[PDB]
Design a protein around this nucleic acid. Sequence first.
RNA 1: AAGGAGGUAAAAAUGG
RNA 2: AAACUUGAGUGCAGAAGAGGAAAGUGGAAUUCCAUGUGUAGCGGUGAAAUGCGCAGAGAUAUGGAGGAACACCAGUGGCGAAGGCGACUUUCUGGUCUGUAACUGACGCUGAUGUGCGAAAGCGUGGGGAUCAAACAGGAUUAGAUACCCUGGUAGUCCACGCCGUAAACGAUGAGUGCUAAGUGUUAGGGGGCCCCUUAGUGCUGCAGCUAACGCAUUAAGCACUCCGCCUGGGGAGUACGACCGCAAGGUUGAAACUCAAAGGAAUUGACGGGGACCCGCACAAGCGGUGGAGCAUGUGGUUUAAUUCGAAGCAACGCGA
Lengths: 63, 131, 273
Amino acid sequence: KVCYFTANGITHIDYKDTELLKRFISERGKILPRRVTGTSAKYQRMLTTAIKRSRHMALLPYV
Amino acid sequence: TMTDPIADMLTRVRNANMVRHEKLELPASNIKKEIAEILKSEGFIKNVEYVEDDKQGVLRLFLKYGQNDERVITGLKRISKPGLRVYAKASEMPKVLNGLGIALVSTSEGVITDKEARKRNVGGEIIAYVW
Amino acid sequence: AIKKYKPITNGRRNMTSLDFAEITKTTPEKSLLKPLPKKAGRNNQGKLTVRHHGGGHKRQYRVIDFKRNKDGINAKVDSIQYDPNRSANIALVVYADGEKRYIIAPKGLEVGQIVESGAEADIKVGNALPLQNIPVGTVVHNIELKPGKGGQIARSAGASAQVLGKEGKYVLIRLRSGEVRMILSTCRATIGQVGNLQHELVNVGKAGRSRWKGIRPTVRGSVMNPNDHPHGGGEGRAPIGRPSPMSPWGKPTLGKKTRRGKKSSDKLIVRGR
RNA sequence: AAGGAGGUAAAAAUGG
RNA sequence: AAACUUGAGUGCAGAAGAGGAAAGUGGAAUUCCAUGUGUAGCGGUGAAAUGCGCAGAGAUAUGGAGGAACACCAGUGGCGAAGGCGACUUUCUGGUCUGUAACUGACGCUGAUGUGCGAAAGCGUGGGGAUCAAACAGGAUUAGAUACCCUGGUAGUCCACGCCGUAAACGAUGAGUGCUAAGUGUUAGGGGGCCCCUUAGUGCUGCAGCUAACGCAUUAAGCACUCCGCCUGGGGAGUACGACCGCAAGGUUGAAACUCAAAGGAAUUGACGGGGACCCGCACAAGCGGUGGAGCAUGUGGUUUAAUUCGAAGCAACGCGA
Ligand SMILES: [Mg+2]
Ligand SMILES: [Mg+2]
Ligand SMILES: [Mg+2]
Ligand SMILES: [Mg+2]
Ligand SMILES: [Mg+2]
Ligand SMILES: [Mg+2]
Ligand SMILES: [Mg+2]
Ligand SMILES: [Mg+2]
Ligand SMILES: [Mg+2]
Ligand SMILES: [Mg+2]
């Protein structure tokens, strides 16, 4: 399949882009696995770091 | 790192012969070229080509197979090595396979075969056995 | 910090001392000194009422500003000095109007640093503020019990307390002893921990050094006679030989609590040590 | 469909 | 003695990373403390009991204290010489990979002795202490149970600075170098048109060759060269003595007398397992009728007697030899 970030060409992920992060976050707030979301590993790392930043800044929930 | 180009060349020849390759390209040197010429003259290989390019040049050997696909080269053995060098006298020159093989030698009169060493009555460093 | 002596003699063997690297001036401020003759544990009747005090090196008293009531004016730490009258070191500070005072030297206070006191002071080591204005969680020392009386709590070397919470008229504090108690929020405290943290590690090493410190020898009860001590007498060595160990004055002295009842502070003391 | 690698539950009397 | 750029480094342009060190921030959860509601159990196990609880436990709600670890991401994934490294943020800092072809011109490989790092436990000093938990106490199990199981519980588990220097510290596989069919994934790149080629890793499958066999097989255990370490039957024994190191615990180096004719490896066939999968059977299930309850008949055990003849003892002895 194809990766959202690879297709859209975006080469950076901003932790304040809560709407985008909600795409890859689960219903309960867990980070969806790469094999499910289709994302590449390179951008999966960026996504995890951005999601944890947002959790710290309370933009996104933990649980 | 690399420590014995002659051993590397002999092992290249042995590996290519085992896999029944037709040609073999290796980096060149004068001693290697003389060894290849001796092999051709004795009939163990088919042809030898020298490519006078940059980076010391290349040797392109062409191996020889008889009828029934039998391998002309049965085996090559490095005799003298950097870790222990072997020399022999003219009267002590060894016969490879009771004479059916050649011993490549390095002498004051150039690198020759054991037959030529015995004929000219000279010794030297026994580079290798081929049979 | 700690220097370990070589065993050149059995007296020096295992002895240690402070290296005094923190000290930056080895003489005191003349105008802040007062005489301190020794009492040797003898009261106004001339009688020994506390044992084991006497002799020891002569000492001058350094007047120390425990009150820290000179507010709104910066003071620059001129020096850190030795003080024989207490475990902590003391910092001579010079106020911007030219008045000089000693304060308890906090851990980390450096020569040339600035300190201030008052409700508006910043929360940094050596600043003094009302507990009203000190945040929860801050480590403090030299804590007042009555506003304006001067610090009385957490003044020894390495001492500190932690602000825990703020009730109406009182602030909760955890003292070095582990006690948690209330203190009037108008009382002042100094930010930080008292310096000279290695004080407690010193191995005094020999009897004479205690004598220099003015401590006379402690004779054990069990090696006196019955008329001297409840533990006295018995042929040869003897065990305590009664239900509880006793003080020289005939009171139980292992586990017996002595804090008096019906004290005003009992409703301020939230959790004992 | 059959084999290889990781994690991971639930169960448990005793002696042959 | 003089040249070269292929090895080795450097410059230039790029890539990823739980590599390391120090500070700071954060959510979940456990324990404890206080308080409101509330009643007689909680907890635990194969089943129980110790223990906790009518002085109000356990449950529930709120707040506080404090320590420790970072759920999802997470992957034969990444990084590191190895040990190891997984919340996030900032500072300092190491290494590696890709392309390029200015630059040096063999400056390389290995490496005895040496010098450092090195999981966990452990030692010293000072802190810290939630959880878990050697020792230990009680309960249970048992013929016994110094255990496995349950209830507690100290060192320790955490931090700083020193010490120790060992592990199945393993890929049980020393380092460097070249050469020898292929197919297919994945991590980080590069070049030419989803395809092809290509570099460095990381996996699987598999030729030639190797191997006692199992298996290895471009990440060799194939073919070769260089250097280092190590082995020479099993015990005795990693012991003794000596030496060096350590606070200690112990570490490193390291025999012999004596004793046996074996000890070992891989694989094969059986047998067995308080190993597994599947298939079948009045084995369960469905259903009818019984036995176990009463009297009596009969056989058996037991007891008794002079003898109560002998034989049969789980199914597969007991209306059995009869
Ligand atoms: Mg005394
Ligand atoms: Mg006496
Ligand atoms: Mg008396
Ligand atoms: Mg007595
Ligand atoms: Mg006696
Ligand atoms: Mg440890
Ligand atoms: Mg236990
Ligand atoms: Mg070892
Ligand atoms: Mg080993
Ligand atoms: Mg590869």
